[PDB]
């Protein structure tokens, strides 16, 4: 056999290594070692491993990180074996998605999924609060006034779960709302951003959302949110099956709210892409496993619950009601995501963007002056 190996973050019960384990038993002269990454991890080491030569054949990257990768020549040209390819279109894929592979005009990947944000909430703890849970919060007041009403720690619950964790993880949750707001990554020191970030400043101050917000990731956030200890979760696609488990109260998940009535929607977008390395010793073995996983997108919802990268396949109803009505949402929430990037530097963008959340969410500084500092060091690294 060929023997490939494959890096990603994806959970033992997450696509990846359950594609790899069908994949294997083809038993078609090629065969794949999986190693799991940690999120924090997939990035800077993935780096060292190619530079080293410790590099893996494949990797399911974080889109953002993609064009890091793809212009410093870590990543194979994979334009000639996509056009040759009688399984991968370039025409199936959100435009979205598609260029986030792209560099210079070239193709360096293919999506592996994509998502965005969306509010999750326990429509049994609406009742019991007197709630009408047919009728989630449309606006950020209406959403911090929600939130405490259903903060009551006598009953160990929050009102709202989500993450300011200083990784991309912070990133990713405060980007919509500095966007529904006016705001951009390329511009995220406006009035509008200083609202959004003061609004978080409120959801700690007032103890509506545990102060672990400041370290914890979306996935573990989420976990409290199942248990019944937060009234309400900001978090994606990727939480509906285990929450399907592991919720014992009926729910439902809806829009972002947005900053003022009938202000715009808006999120960024989610998920991975698959790539491999430049110097792998079996392009065209990689490639066929790429092509396998891209054949199994149609069964990624149902299987998973994650959603495909995609116009070609829109998702099918599954059956199950809970799960069906959170497709309808996050497709409805999906249609105004906006890419982070494209961006070599997006790792330094984003860090200016955590450093400023963590500077005003501790009182270190002014919600205005934190943003002011990010904005300075975007303009630079962003040039
Ligand atoms: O933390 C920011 C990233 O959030 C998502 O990444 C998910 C991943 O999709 C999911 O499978 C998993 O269990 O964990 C992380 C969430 O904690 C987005 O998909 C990424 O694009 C974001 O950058």
Redesign the pocket.
């Known amino acids: 056999d060929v023997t490939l190996t494959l890096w990603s ?3 033992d019960i ?1 696509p990846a290594p359950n594609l790899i384990k069908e994949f294997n038993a083809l038993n078609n002269g090629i065969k794949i070692e999986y190693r799991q990454l940690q ?1 924090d991890d997939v990035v800077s080491e993935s780096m060292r491993a190619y530079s080293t030569g410790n590099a893996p054949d494949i990797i399911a990257i ?3 990180n993609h064009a890091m990768f793809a212009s410093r020549g870590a990543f194979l040209d994979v334009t000639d074996m996509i056009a040759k390819s009688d399984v991968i279109k370039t025409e199936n894929y959100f435009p979205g998605p598609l260029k986030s592979v792209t560099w210079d005009g070239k193709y360096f990947g293919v999506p592996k999924a994509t ?1 965005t944000i969306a509010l999750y909430y326990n429509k049994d703890l609406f009742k019991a609060a007197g709630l009408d849970a047919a009728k989630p919060p449309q606006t950020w007041d209406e959403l911090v006034d929600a939130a405490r009403k259903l903060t009551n720690p006598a009953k160990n619950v929050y009102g709202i779960s989500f993450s300011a964790k200083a990784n ?2 912070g990133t ?1 949750q405060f980007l919509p709302w500095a966007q529904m707001a006016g705001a951009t990554y390329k511009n995220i020191n406006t009035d509008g951003a200083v609202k959004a970030l003061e609004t978080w400043k409120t959801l700690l101050d007032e103890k509506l959302a545990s102060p672990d917000t400041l370290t914890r ?3 573990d956030s989420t976990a409290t949110f199942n248990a019944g200890n937060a009234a309400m979760a900001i978090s ?1 696609p ?1 939480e509906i099956d285990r929450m399907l488990k592991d919720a014992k109260f009926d729910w439902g998940v809806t829009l972002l709210p947005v900053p003022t009535p009938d202000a715009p929607r808006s999120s960024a977008m ?3 892409n698959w790539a491999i390395f430049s110097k792998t010793k079996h392009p065209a073995e990689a490639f066929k496993a790429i092509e396998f996983f891209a054949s199994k997108d149609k069964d990624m919802f149902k299987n998973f619950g994650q959603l495909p990268a995609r116009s070609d396949i829109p998702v099918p109803p599954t059956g199950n009601a809970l799960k069906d009505e959170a497709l309808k949402t996050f497709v409805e929430q999906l249609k105004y995501a906006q890419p982070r990037g494209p961006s070599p530097e997006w790792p330094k963008i984003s860090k200016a963007i955590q450093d400023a959340i963590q500077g005003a969410l501790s009182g270190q500084m002014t919600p205005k002056a934190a943003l002011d500092q990010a904005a300075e060091k975007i303009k630079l690294v962003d040039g």
Do not use: H, I, V
Request: aromatic share 24%; hydrophobic share 25%.
């Open positions: 973050l994806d959970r997450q999120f974080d889109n953002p998502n991309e993880e990713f990731s979306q996935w994606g990727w989610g998920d991975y």
